[PDB]
Design a protein around this ligand. Structure first.
Ligand SMILES: CNC(=O)NC(=N)NCCC[C@H](NC(=O)Cn1nncc1CO/N=C/c1ccnc2ccccc12)C(=O)N(Cc1ccccc1)Cc1ccccc1
Ligand SMILES: O=[P-]([O-])[O-]
Length: 497
């Protein structure tokens, strides 16, 4: 009965705001007018991106920004709300460029959350910016607070949330109350910086939007799918950094939660979240990419999957060889490594040499260019069927995606997601989810329902014995135990009544 959220980033850079126009796509490729009223109906949230934190340790626009043209752009977005009384125009603070460990504004993120007074000043600047520009809530996209900073970051979300609540009461906005989201890490390495405090991070949020993409990159040594839903045994596996987080769990508890190595996948990151106590399924939103990542230098035999490769990893892209054949946007943006779905469709349709292939374990598509040795990992309306069924089945809150201008012109990716959740005539009850590798970790937050005979005092239990006691089902870790379950370390809690 609750509508799945559908959260779409709208990114526009300072130069384009300052030269804003809706009638010249070589100045602004994706102007607000491209968000038609039928698109506005399919979205629950649009994430205007990106604001920053300045050296005053306040949320601010980039200072080169033309303020009147910024307001004009935001007003066109907030005007969309007339087609959809559920729709929110959020704004987003951060992104990779601003907030990465080596980003130009990084120190500001660190310092803004560092003390109580600085959090109060930061928090106030967020709401004040929200109210002044007419936005409907705040999304924080710091990539990423480190374990030392995370208590500051949490405090900062708490205080912002208090100020959003005051503000909803002052504006009478209980029918569409002001909201707080974050863009969360979607792979265990980054996730491990804050994983041990996930319940605290998510509690003040309406949603944690997982970046369950960018899970392969030039930075890995072997090509892979950047957003595989489930795992492929023929693909690479990785060290599970969460087994080293500061959780205070036992070896058995750690081992059962965090198999290692493991398959880097959407499913994995979602289960990683569900394992933790006090992270509800309904606040978890699955990110999907509206773009592919492209590799060169590959030798297939397997469609260019799981191949060594020669893709530069530097930033900026370090030369002018735009090798991604038929990628015109790539030339425009001076980087062949990232191609929008809108462009990939045109590459596949033209005579550029690609085949579209499908991995039935990962439930994701891929292009392969056999004559030049290219491999592209992307998502389409077909991969979205499986991800949408997963969202419904796992009782997740919705889907988030980056970014709106990467949809094709007709908006088919977005229409597909709206349809899989909301169309009466769409049936996925027979959609086969396949036999790819599921992440099987179990933690305190996702214990299965189980039954077992009642624990009996005096009985000598062997290894593996299952009993039920004080609301749970417990298993002995070795034999022969006679202790009451929960009273010492012999018993592992494995399930709930
Ligand atoms: C909602 N937030 C996000 O979705 N964040 C996000 N995807 N962050 C990672 C972004 C890295 C990206 N950069 C690259 O991917 C460049 N690149 N391509 N191949 C290699 C590189 C170099 O950067 N690698 C970043 C990276 C990203 C993720 N994990 C890593 C792990 C180890 C090392 C590096 C990474 C980037 O900075 N830009 C392009 C881009 C943004 C979003 C999605 C895909 C691409 C710049 C940009 C442009 C317009 C608007 C905002 C941001
Ligand atoms: O570089 P990292 O383990 O967050």
């Amino acid at each position: 009965s609750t509508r799945k959220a559908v959260i779409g980033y709208y990114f526009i850079p300072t130069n384009q705001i300052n030269n804003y126009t809706e009638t010249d796509t070589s100045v602004v490729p994706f102007p607000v007018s491209n968000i038609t009223p039928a698109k506005a109906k399919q979205l629950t949230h649009i994430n205007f991106s990106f604001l920053d934190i300045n050296s005053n340790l306040e949320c601010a626009w980039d200072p080169a920004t033309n303020d009147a043209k910024a307001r004009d752009v935001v007003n066109r977005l907030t005007a969309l709300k007339a087609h959809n009384p559920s729709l929110r125009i959020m704004f987003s603070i951060g992104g990779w460029y601003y907030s990465n460990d080596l980003g130009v504004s990084h120190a500001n993120y660190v310092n803004a959350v560092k003390t109580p007074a600085a959090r109060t000043k930061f928090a106030q600047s967020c709401v004040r910016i929200m109210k002044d520009y007419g936005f409907d809530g705040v999304d924080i996209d710091w990539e990423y607070p480190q374990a030392a900073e995370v208590d500051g970051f949490i405090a900062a979300l708490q205080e912002i949330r208090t100020l959003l609540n005051q503000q909803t009461i002052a504006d009478g906005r209980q029918a569409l109350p002001y909201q707080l989201t974050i863009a969360g890490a979607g792979g265990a390495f980054f996730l491990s910086r804050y994983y041990s405090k996930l319940a605290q991070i998510v509690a003040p949020l309406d949603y944690i939007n997982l970046m369950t993409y960018d899970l392969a990159g030039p930075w890995e040594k072997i090509t892979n799918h950047q957003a595989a839903l489930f795992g492929d045994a023929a693909g690479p596996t990785f060290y599970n950094a969460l087994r080293e987080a500061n959780l205070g769990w036992s070896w058995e508890e750690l081992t059962r939660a965090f198999p290692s190595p493991f398959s880097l996948t959407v499913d994995a990151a979602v289960q990683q979240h569900l394992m933790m106590e006090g992270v509800p399924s309904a606040k978890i939103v699955m990110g999907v990419p509206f773009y592919g990542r492209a590799f060169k230098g590959v030798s297939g035999g397997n469609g260019g999957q799981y191949s060594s490769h020669s893709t530069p990893g530097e930033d900026p892209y370090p030369n002018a060889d735009y090798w991604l054949v038929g990628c015109d946007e790539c030339v425009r943006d001076k980087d062949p490594r990232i191609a929008s779905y809108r462009q990939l469709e045109q590459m596949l349709q033209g005579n550029y040499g690609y085949q579209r292939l499908w991995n039935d374990k990962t439930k994701t598509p891929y292009l392969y260019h056999a004559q030049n040795g290219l491999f592209v990992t992307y998502d389409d309306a077909e991969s979205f069927k499986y991800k949408a069924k997963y969202i419904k089945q796992q009782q997740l809150g919705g889907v988030m995606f980056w970014h709106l201008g990467q949809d094709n012109r007709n908006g088919d990716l977005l229409a597909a997601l709206d349809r899989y959740f909301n169309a009466a005539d769409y049936d996925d009850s027979q959609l086969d989810m396949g036999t790819g590798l599921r992440y099987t970790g179990v933690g305190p937050g996702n214990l299965p329902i189980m039954t077992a005979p009642a624990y009996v005092p005096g009985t000598t239990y062997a290894q593996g014995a299952l009993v039920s006691y004080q609301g749970y089902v417990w298993q002995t870790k070795w034999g022969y135990i006679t202790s009451a379950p929960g009273s010492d370390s012999a018993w592992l809690k494995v399930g709930r009544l």
